[PDB]
Amino acid sequence: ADIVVHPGETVNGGTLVNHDNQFVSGTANGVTVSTGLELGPDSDENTGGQWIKAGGTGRNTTVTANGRQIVQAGGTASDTVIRDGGGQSLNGLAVNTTLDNRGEQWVHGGGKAAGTIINQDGYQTIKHGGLATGTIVNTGAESSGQMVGGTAESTTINKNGRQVIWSSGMARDTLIYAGGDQTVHGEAHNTRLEGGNQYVHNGGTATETLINRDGWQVIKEGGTAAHTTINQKGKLQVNAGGKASDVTQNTGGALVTSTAATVTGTNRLGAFSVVAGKADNVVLENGGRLDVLSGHTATNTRVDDGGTLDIRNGGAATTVSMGNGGVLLADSGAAVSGTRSDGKAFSIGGGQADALMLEKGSSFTLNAGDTATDTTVNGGLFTARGGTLAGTTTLNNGAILTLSGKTVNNDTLTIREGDALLQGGSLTGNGSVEKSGSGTLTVSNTTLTQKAVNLNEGTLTLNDSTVTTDVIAQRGTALKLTGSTVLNGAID
């Protein structure tokens, strides 16, 4: 059967089945289309369907599982519901289409889809020369979502929504909320990350990405970004071999990168750059992080609240400016100079550490053969694979000192406030341990040989340890020997 709807004619209802064609040159309203896609989109043998021809209009068409609506150039479709794997082939104009349950819309060259809502595994594909405007993408981030080989304008990507821009594709003016994603192999212009994510892949380019709160722009290796703005609690992340230029990093904006990436712009302290293995004036806060890799350098790094600076073995960082809440990860094989929050200078160089301040989150690793002098660990972590502690090594407020080899102390190890844990390995020498404050110093699974332990206040617990020293206790203290601990030889 071949129903024809002529210009000037308007038909209502009906259901197309069994390869029936309806050729619409007038208006067809409310037709249910259940044929024309029996063989699926990848065949070219299908027959049947609703053909909206040049000058014709299809309104309130429902396209079901085996249904195909073909909107030809000059044709118009309005309020189309496409469900259950049904499809509309679009060479004309479609307005306010809804795709549910794997319903599909293929926007061909010259075709224009305005206001498509993509729900629950629906799929809109924009081929070369195709156009979509006002697309609302509600699915694909849980083969679904929106694929852009042509052009997409004024797209909103909601929670669970995914938009993929193929290398030939272009997306302009995209709004991305929390739980929505855009993957860029092609071009993305003017993207607002309102909590959402944008992933720029190898060969992809993103221009004018605006990263608002909880937004995340990720530049993979071979990806490019130009004109990124990072607002408070937004994050730009540039991987090794990725590039981002003209980054405007506002206060509280997070930058996550390393010396293997390329990043240039301005932050609240002025121009900054990560170029050809060298960083300068990087400001790190709110999840910001800079990894300085072996053989590379960072100067004038500001590490503030929630910022992390990680200097690898063989990496260098100078004029590091540690602020309150700033985190430092370094080892004794690194070269570091800067100032702590309290204003005091610290340094690492030629295997010598001096005046390291390790707050909660910060960690230092002392390599075999090296020396750390006047370290204060205040809630942080200090790991020693060997080497020597010197000057006054202070362990306060949740400090952990983990030994994995033979470490030496001939000076003063002191706990003055809160709790501390010394664990593993071995600590020897003619040094002494001082314990004050009401906290507990736990020594666990360590061989501890020292001249004296001055137990002045609070609790000293010796668990599973072989200890060789003179414990000299005073009032206000408690000494516990637990597990397999052996002590040599006495307490005064």
Q: Structure solved using which method?
A: X-ray
CB < 8 Å & 24+ apart, contacts of 293-298: 293/258, 293/259, 293/260, 296/259, 296/260, 297/259, 298/259
Fill in the DSSP letter of residue 14: -
CB < 8 Å & 24+ apart, contacts of 294-299: 296/259, 296/260, 297/259, 298/259
Query: What domain range is 354 assigned to?
Result: 1-492
Judge contact between 165 and 137, C-beta under 8 A: no
- Which string of DSSP letters, residue by residue, matches 374-431? S-EEEB-EEEESS-EEESEEEEETTEEEEESSEEEESSEEEE-SS-EEEESSEEESS-
Give just the sign of the alpha carbon dihedral 279, 285, 290, 296: positive
Q: Number of structural domains, the chain?
A: 1
What letters, b where the CB count within 10 A reaches 16 and e where it falls short, cover 197-208? bbbbbeebbbbb
Judge contact between 194 and 180, C-beta under 8 A: no
Rounded CA separation 400/380 (Å): 7
Judge contact between 47 and 67, C-beta under 8 A: no
Cβ neighbors of 152 (< 8 A, separation 6 or more) are 126, 131, 132, 133, 135, 146, 163, 165, 169, 170, 171, 172, 174
**Beta bridge partner(s), residue 441:** 420, 460
Closest C-alpha among 42, 94, 32, 93 to residue 65 = 32
**Beta bridge partner(s), residue 163:** 146, 182
**Beta bridge partner(s), residue 297:** 278, 316
Judge contact between 179 and 196, C-beta under 8 A: yes
Helices then strands, counting H and E runs in the chain, come out as 0, 67
Resolution in A: 2.5
Output the six-digit token pair for 77.
């479709």
What letters, b where the CB count within 10 A reaches 16 and e where it falls short, cover 164-189? bbbeebbbbbbbbbeebbbbbbbbbb
Q: Which amino acid is at 300?
A: N
Q: Which amino acid is at 240?
A: A
Rounded CA separation 280/266 (Å): 11
Neighbours of 304 (CB within 10 A): 21
Radius of gyration from C-alpha coordinates of the chain? 33
Rounded CA separation 456/185 (Å): 65
Rounded CA separation 388/334 (Å): 16
Output the six-digit token pair for 232.
């408070």
Angle at 419 between CA 418 and CA 425, to 5 degrees: 150
CB < 8 Å & 24+ apart, contacts of 361-367: 361/308, 361/327, 362/327, 362/328, 362/329, 363/328, 363/329, 364/328, 364/329, 364/330, 364/331, 364/332, 365/330, 365/331, 365/332, 366/331, 366/332, 366/407, 367/313, 367/331, 367/332, 367/333
Which CATH number is 193's domain given?
Answer: 2.160.20.20
- Which string of DSSP letters, residue by residue, matches 220-232? -TT-EEES-EE-T
Judge contact between 322 and 305, C-beta under 8 A: no
SS3 351: coil
Rounded CA separation 147/490 (Å): 76
Rounded CA separation 163/152 (Å): 10
Closest C-alpha among 409, 373, 371, 413 to residue 395 = 413
Task: Tell me how far the alpha carbon of residue 423 is from its chain's centroid.
Answer: 34
